[PDB]
């Protein structure tokens, strides 16, 4: 094969080798495919059906603009599914149907701007979703999270993100196990509206490196099992009685921040404002 | 009710008393004396922990003249590195530091002020002591 080969009838790399379409002259037992940097541009019905054994594959910056039902059909045991930095336009409502076992799903920068239309629902044994670096202005988890009785950990950093309504997470009022990490970092927000996360079971936050000024009185408050939080490099406002709310809950949570979120202009920690 | 005189100042005087049972000694001394009006200066303390000051952090119970601020509890000493030197501090051991201060005033007010700073730590956290902070005002 053109390809290499790093484990015999297992792992392949035909990694930066100009095709144009899914080689297969490579066994069908293979389990690891790394097909990242060839201009494949379609992926269409039934585009692997000659690796029914895959369980990991990549497909990074493959220029794919089009996926269309069961473009992986028959891969039920794949866990892993990169799909990096490739300008998708039109999805099939159908694209990933067949990843019965899917675990891990990137989608970085592949021109995503809401979830509202991203096919995943299905994805029940999906684990970890993670959609960095994207068009995605708001950020409104839609009902199909439900199925996703098992994501523990959701990436949204780096995207178009200005704000955090209410409704936002709603969904999850109706997820009682679920030990979600959330990362909201890197993002243009600078506004979090009260009551966000009233009644939601966050395990990890991370709120750093954007643009909050301040927060809502109470808005972590009733945060469930909530252990690690981040809120550093932030133009954080430390006037009273403003700052009072959080530089308190910090100093009552400090064990749980990672980082010291700092005083514009101060540099002071904001743990350390006490207010009259 | 043995008052002790910590620091008399140009705008104000400071002074401490037990609110706790075991009544152990301390040595305060600010250095320069808070200027209720704005000033820096170097707290100077000497002690001797009953328990490690590991997970060391004070509760505070401000009372200005007129009114009293709710409990806020202000953590010193976290698991981290960036602590100050004494959170090594195990039992018995001699805590003789310095620390820089800088307490950025108060605008017009002379009632007393009633400052209650009760220290905790250790494994399972329990209390290190207690002090009523008084301090009186009458800037000349
Ligand atoms: C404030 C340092 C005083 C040093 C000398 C203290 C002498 C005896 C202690 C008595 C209790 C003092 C309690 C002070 C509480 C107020 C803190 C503060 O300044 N907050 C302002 C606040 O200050 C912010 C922080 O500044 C500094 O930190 P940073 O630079 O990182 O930000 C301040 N820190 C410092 O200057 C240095 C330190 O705290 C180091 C303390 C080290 C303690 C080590 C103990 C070791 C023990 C070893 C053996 C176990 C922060 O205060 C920390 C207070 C800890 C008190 C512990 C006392 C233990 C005594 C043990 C014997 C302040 O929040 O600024 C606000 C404005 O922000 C824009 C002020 O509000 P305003 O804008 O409306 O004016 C705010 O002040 C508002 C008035 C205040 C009441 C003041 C009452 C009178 C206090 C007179 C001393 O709050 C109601
Ligand atoms: C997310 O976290 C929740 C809540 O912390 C997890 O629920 C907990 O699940 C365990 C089972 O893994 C329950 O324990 C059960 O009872 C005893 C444990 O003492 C054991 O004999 C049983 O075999 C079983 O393990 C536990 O009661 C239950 N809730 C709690 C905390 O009381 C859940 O597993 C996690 N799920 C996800 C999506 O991460
Ligand atoms: C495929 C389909 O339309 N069926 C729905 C779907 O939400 C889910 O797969 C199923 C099992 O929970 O419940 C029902
Ligand atoms: C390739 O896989 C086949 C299928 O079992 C096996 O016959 C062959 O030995 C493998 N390659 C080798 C010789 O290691």
Not at chain 1, 42 to 58: A, I, K, W
Not at chain 2, 73 to 93: M, N, P, Q, T
Not at chain 2, 125 to 135: G, T, W
């Amino acid at each position: 094969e053109p390809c290499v080969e790093v484990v015999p009838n297992i792992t392949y790399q035909c990694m930066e080798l100009n095709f144009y379409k899914i080689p297969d002259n490579l066994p069908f037992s293979t389990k690891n495919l790394d097909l990242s940097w060839n201009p494949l541009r379609h992926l269409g019905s039934y585009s692997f059906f000659s690796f029914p054994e895959l369980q990991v594959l990549d497909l990074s910056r493959c220029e794919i603009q089009t996926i269309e039902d069961g473009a992986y059909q028959s891969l039920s045991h794949l866990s892993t599914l990169i799909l990096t930095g490739n300008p998708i336009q039109s999805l099939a409502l159908g694209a990933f149907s067949g990843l019965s076992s899917l675990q891990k799903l990137v989608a970085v920068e592949t021109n995503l701007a809401s979830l509202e239309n991203f096919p995943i629902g299905h994805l029940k044994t999906l684990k970890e979703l993670n959609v960095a670096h994207n068009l995605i202005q708001s950020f409104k988890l839609p009902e199909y999270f439900s199925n996703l009785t098992n994501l523990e950990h959701l990436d949204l950093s780096s995207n178009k993100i200005q704000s955090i309504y209410c409704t936002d997470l709603r969904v999850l009022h109706q997820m009682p196990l679920l030990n979600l990490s959330l990362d909201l970092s890197l993002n243009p927000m600078n506004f979090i509206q009260p009551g966000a996360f009233k009644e939601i079971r966050l395990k990890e936050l991370a709120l750093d490196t954007n643009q909050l000024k301040s927060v809502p009185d109470g808005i972590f408050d009733r945060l469930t099992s909530l252990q690690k939080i981040w809120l550093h490099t932030n133009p954080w406002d430390c006037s009273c009685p403003r700052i009072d709310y959080l530089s308190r809950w910090l100093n009552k949570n400090s064990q749980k921040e990672q980082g010291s979120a700092k005083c514009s202009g101060s540099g002071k920690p904001v743990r350390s404002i006490i207010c009259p | 009710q043995k008052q002790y005189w910590v620091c008399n100042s140009s705008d104000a005087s400071i002074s401490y008393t037990y609110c706790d049972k075991m009544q152990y000694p301390i040595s305060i001394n600010v250095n320069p004396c808070i200027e209720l009006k704005g000033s820096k200066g170097l707290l100077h303390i000497f002690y001797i922990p009953r328990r490690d000051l590991k997970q060391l952090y004070f509760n505070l119970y401000i009372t200005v003249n007129t009114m009293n601020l709710p409990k806020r509890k202000e953590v010193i000493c976290r698991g981290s590195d960036d602590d100050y030197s004494f959170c090594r501090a195990l039992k018995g051991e001699t805590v003789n530091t310095t620390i820089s201060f800088s307490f950025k005033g108060i605008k017009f007010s002379k009632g007393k002020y009633k400052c209650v700073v009760e220290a905790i730590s250790g494994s399972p956290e329990e209390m290190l002591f207690c002090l009523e902070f008084v301090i009186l005002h009458q800037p000349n």
